[PDB]
Amino acid sequence: GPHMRWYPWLRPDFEKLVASYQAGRGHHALLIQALPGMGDDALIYALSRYLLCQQPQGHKSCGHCRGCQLMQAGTHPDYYTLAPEKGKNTLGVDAVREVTEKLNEHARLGGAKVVWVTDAALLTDAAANALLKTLEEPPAETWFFLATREPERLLATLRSRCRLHYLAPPPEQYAVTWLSREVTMSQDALLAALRLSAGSPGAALALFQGDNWQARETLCQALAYSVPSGDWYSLLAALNHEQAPARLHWLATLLMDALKRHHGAAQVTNVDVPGLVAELANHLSPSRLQAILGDVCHIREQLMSVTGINRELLITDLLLRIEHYLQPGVVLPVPHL
Amino acid sequence: MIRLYPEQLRAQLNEGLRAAYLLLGNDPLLLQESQDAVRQVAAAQGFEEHHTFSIDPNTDWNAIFSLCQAMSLFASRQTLLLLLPENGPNAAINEQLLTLTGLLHDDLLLIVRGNKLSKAQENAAWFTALANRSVQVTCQTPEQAQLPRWVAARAKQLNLELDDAANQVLCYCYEGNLLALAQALERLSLLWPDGKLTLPRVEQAVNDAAHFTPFHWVDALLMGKSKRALHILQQLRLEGSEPVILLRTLQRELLLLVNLKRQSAHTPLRALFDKHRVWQNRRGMMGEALNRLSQTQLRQAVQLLTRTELTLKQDYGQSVWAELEGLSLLLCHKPLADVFIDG
Amino acid sequence: GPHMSYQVLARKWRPQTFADVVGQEHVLTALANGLSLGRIHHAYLFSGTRGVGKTSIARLLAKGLNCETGITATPCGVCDNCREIEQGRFVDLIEIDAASRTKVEDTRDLLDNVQYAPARGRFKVYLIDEVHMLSRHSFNALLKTLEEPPEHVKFLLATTDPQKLPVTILSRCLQFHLKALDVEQIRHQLEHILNEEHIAHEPRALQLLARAAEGSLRDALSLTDQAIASGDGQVSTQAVSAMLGTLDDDQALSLVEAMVEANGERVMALINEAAARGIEWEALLVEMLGLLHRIAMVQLSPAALGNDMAAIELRMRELARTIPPTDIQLYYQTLLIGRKELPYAPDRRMGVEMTLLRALAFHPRMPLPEP
């Protein structure tokens, strides 16, 4: 997904919110909860296009007006966007402070003002708290739009302010049909990709479009080699990358399917890789699988959360600890009770 | 483009000044001596006006306009001295040096000093523009293998009787600080007019003013010298170096050690070192390190390193300077380490 | 047009007198007694949870302090000072979003300007909300003023986390704690609001909104606005139940029965069925924890079990009869840690899967088939 592709699974919610916004019964601060690539960006863009210019027929775009000319070119000064600096990774509180004071300085063109945060989960504590008063009491006809993948990660003091909207994932069969139309791959691979992305067709499309599929198949081959021999260290060659958290999530998914197979669950998530799950079930004990799953999830969370942490050291330590666990007579860890 | 050592500098200085002299290295004492000798011989040749400029992203850049080629009003030959930053020149400093070199003339002698330039910068346009006109002086700190010979040579320079034990003590206390060593020799000459130097006072007129680098610490770890490793760690902590640079320097070598130990069971270390492109200085050191350590010790080391990294970048605590110490003892001549203390 | 913008209930229904509070009586009694007598202080620090009323309480305190009727426990909206305080544009009430301006320079400028006499107001009230975000330099700057301020200066601070504030600042102010609102108070306030707004509602929807508000009235109002937007202009039980993903069937009960029976196939089939209908996982885990709590209570006292879950009483009675208390406690602990772990491994489905697998691990899953 390059940029802002309209999604049919977004059409219903969209009009509903328009019905709320057109009648003047819409909350100023709306927090979107959607999966990565679910299309929340397109929803926010369409909403802002509706809001920020002369009233169109009442639906669709805003026609051919000054608002559309400025918005499409990205020149509208009443369309404030909060995006992390590419050199950094988080929304500096200075950017939010500047945006809030600029909003306080009244609009420039006719109409309302729209502030859009490209991702709420990337807000630091100071940046998140710098928005509290502005959300509580917007100056005049100010509408916010915050996108997130889970509202619980966001501060409780901010989740109170915003009316929460939920973009439910599309039904799995419909998403499978859509992806098969969009991408020519076998049904099993399609299903595994969809379940890997928690039913987010946009995320699955992003996974297929890039090299992520090649990385996943390389990781699968490396796991197939490593599982019987017990030489998990080689997996490092496939795990160290800028997308390390996603590959660790894939590994955790494989371990989850292995435990599922041990319990014989009717449903799995790595459908198109039965050989690896069979090998993992055969060669590894359920307690060992659970321990490895816990360690992998913990390492993924530590990599994703703590900014600046060294990827290579953590991945190597995880692999060596797994190596230690595979050896007989080694006490496995348990969740912190 | 002449290349020289400080000891040979007089040989070039008494022959005739070149267009410019470049004083590259990391020894304050050697660079200071070379610069002072060049300035002294220039004054003997009739150079009187000296201007010193420090190369900085915000410093003045009037040095270009300072080449008026019109001093003739007084006609005092000028010497220009430039101080490069810690990391060397940047692009902007590159073209500044280009335009300074383009305006060089006979009446002006240019003295350039700073940290040794890397290969990426040794091909810079200005440095090439100094070809056939410049004399580089190599001033790099002698290592502990070569340091005592240098100390003995300087003691003979001052006509002082240096004992072997005194030489060893001074080498141990003032490692990596040549200026401190010169000051100590002067101070001990002042304390003892007789000229001899023996233990009873050279162990008294000395301090632990040694300056180290993370590479020295990693070398101490590889050679398994616990006492030197701990002393180096203490000196680095006192100096104030950031612990993250220590963590990275040790992480690189520890990961290489883990990979080499894993591959040693199937391939001789001689081919493994060449495949991993290990320099001849470090091949034997890493061979001894591999022969000393087992897989379990390396696994414990990496576990401790990971815990230190987490407690540094997540809790922001100051316990790192302790944990590194344990990691030191974890990899030297039978660590005899623990689990709760690290795990 | 009375609503140029949507005056959301979280803003339109801000209290204007002391009688509009939903029951913060412990602090209101102290405030009324202090205003009624001469006992007035120069530093009030209201703390507590989100959306509980401390900013509104502070604004009401300012209104009572500055109204030209006098120092009245009940402020009068007729007063011009109250008219200006309820809106913006009051020369005396200086409201500073502390998180917006954390720099010590702004605090130093404020403390330079505090010296001047108030304009036409009895007390120059400084209302600093979200005070816990101020930089430590500003915190230390706010020490010597709060201890011996000019008589005409009153400081009102509000924060959601007293611990983050330095102990020195807490030591100079009156600390009021605003307890989280109970279910009944929130439900009564919501029914009063909806009756005043001529919007239809149902008691079950109001009860669900109060339950999900987690003790914060602003959460209740936001959920009510969610229901209004997604309920076609009325608060209906179906709309709120659907939006909250709450459980009306025995899915949680069947899931915990399968888990305690250690039937992994049944557990995973039920979890897959739950994923099919898109049941919210956090609510499922909360319901399972509540059911396990009821199991423990009935094990301790069978009479306590007699509750709303009457139609399913036999099942919980059998589970209490057949399961030791230690296993129930281990199950509750595992599910609770799992609930702590939902906002980890962003795909929450596999998070609940992890929690269920950990819970299942305690009992033997041996392939040994025995009755």
Add this chain to the structure above:
Amino acid sequence: GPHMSYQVLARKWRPQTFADVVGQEHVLTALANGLSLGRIHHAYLFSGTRGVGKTSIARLLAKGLNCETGITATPCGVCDNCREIEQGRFVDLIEIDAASRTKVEDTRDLLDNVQYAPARGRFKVYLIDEVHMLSRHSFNALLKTLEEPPEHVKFLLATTDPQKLPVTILSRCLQFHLKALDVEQIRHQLEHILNEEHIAHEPRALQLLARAAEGSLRDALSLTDQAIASGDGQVSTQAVSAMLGTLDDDQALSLVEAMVEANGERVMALINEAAARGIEWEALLVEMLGLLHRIAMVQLSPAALGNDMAAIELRMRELARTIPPTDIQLYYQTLLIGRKELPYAPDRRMGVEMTLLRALAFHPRMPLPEPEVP
């Protein structure tokens, strides 16, 4: 009393003479001896926790330095200088709020005027409040001033954490340390306050207030003012207990006993009563944990219990000698894990009940019965 101006107790009752200062006998005796005998040092640093007197004692020393009756250890209230000091309008008591004037330029300005002599005073005092707030350059600008000050200038510094000052400053200035006030001292001072001010009070409420603001008297004064506000202008036990959110020790120990003797119905009844009273559940867990810790301490030594819990002292002993310490360790661990995991329970009431039920199930002596069917 008669003052219709209800001045805050934190402000009205600031110490006037060295006789009005409670506690801190160390600093009080040191200053009295160093001012009666002479030998006044040129820099003081009062280091202590919050609300112990880090500033008022400095003002008392300032009064004692330049008084009309000469250098005296008893600051009078008759001469103009002392009253001007108390009003804060005194000419020579330059009160440097170091938090505001923290930049090095302001410190240079302060040092520039040091030699310009005092006006209507034996000494000029530079009372620098919160010195731990100055910048590094500001800290170091005044070194040679502190080491060799003029004969008429005396510094009086007051910081909460001296560890943040550079070590040389700790060298130059005298290091006076003020210990946190004890509970009995706080109770006596509050009794003095509520007797001088005509407010009816009850001793149990005063003890509760003193304990709830441990180590800091200004905390106690603020809590007492807020309790006067909460009550009908009188410090009663009910008002203080309801305000603090604390639960009376007798009833918490009653819950603890019901837990120890495995009486589930009594535990449930007490929980229901606490729910009816509106006491915060986490506060109930906190009180139970504190009582269990006190039980452990009295197992360590019977002297660990002061008069504070005297009302139930006997019961305390009857819990110390009847159960082994390992049971206390298990109980403390269970209740503490419960407190840690409370915020994620279905409800705070549900979480507290489940924690108590877990402590009841897992406790060794007479545990809960297990199902008859294996």
Add this chain to the structure above:
Amino acid sequence: GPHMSYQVLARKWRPQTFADVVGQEHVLTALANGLSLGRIHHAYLFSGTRGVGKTSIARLLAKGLNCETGITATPCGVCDNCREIEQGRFVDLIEIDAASRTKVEDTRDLLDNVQYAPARGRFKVYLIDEVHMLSRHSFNALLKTLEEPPEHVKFLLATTDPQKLPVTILSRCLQFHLKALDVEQIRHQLEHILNEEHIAHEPRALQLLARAAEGSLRDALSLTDQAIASGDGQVSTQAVSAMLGTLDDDQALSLVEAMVEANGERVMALINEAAARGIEWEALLVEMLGLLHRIAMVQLSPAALGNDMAAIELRMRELARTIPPTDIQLYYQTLLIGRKELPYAPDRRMGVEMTLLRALAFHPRM
């Protein structure tokens, strides 16, 4: 006023002759020989810890260099130049509080006087005190002056941290590093100072005062004056012991010592005192954990003592030798669990007490 006149012990007793400086023998001897042979470097930079005489020795150097009797290690008090050095009003001695005159404007103004000949002295002597803090451009001006210094000007730089000084100034300055004063020398001079004044004293009290100061003479004298004030005009052992107990800070070490010996009453008294001396309980427990870590590490190799434990080495060596590694490991695990468990406990004093009780319960002491 009506209290006669009593100065400060820190400012008084400052040495006026090289024989009155106690300790730092190597620096004084080197300076004496350099002045005797006429071998004087252009710039002398003093360095060392606080309160070891760097400024005082520099002032003595400035007095000696301009003495009319000649450059000597023992300048007389007779010379009017020497007397003006005493009073602080000497035209040829330029005392620059570089901690206050950091800006390049003032430094350049005061360094533009190098062109002027001394008024009544052989050498124009600059005493730039606290040189470590100084603007970068002021360092440039000072370096330009020192590169081509007039023959009638000598520099006397003083500082506490020589690291902050640029290397270009260090390479041009003869650096003299001063050691932290040994305890015996501190006690000896404290005895002599107390005897020269009309103050009674006690031997154990004197030893306690000497040990309390961390090798710095100014610290020792400041504590001496404070104890005299608290001691009712007498340096008595009980009064100074109580004073130092009030000012006692290294609580964690005593806590470890009491915990490892299973002394319940002692550890309870220590934690009560640490509560009265208002501190942070998390910081105390972290310090205890770190001390236990160090004790565990020292048993593996003595070199772990390092430099930080120079004033703590005596007790740490005994603790490391006398305690088995397993007990130290168990104590470290208990304290780590307690620190993880502390915030969720009741008020943190209760949690620290409970963790200490947990650690104490391991030993069979009853």
Add this chain to the structure above:
DNA sequence: TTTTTTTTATGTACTCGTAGTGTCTGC
């Protein structure tokens, strides 16, 4: 013998160069 090597977010001082502002001096 030669290169080798870093974790950010937010804030607070400090000091120098360049410009903007006042004002007033014999110009």
Add this chain to the structure above:
DNA sequence: GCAGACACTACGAGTACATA
């Protein structure tokens, strides 16, 4: 007038350091 000079004050930028 008077505008330049000269002061004087403020602002950006580069650097160093602190706390979390």
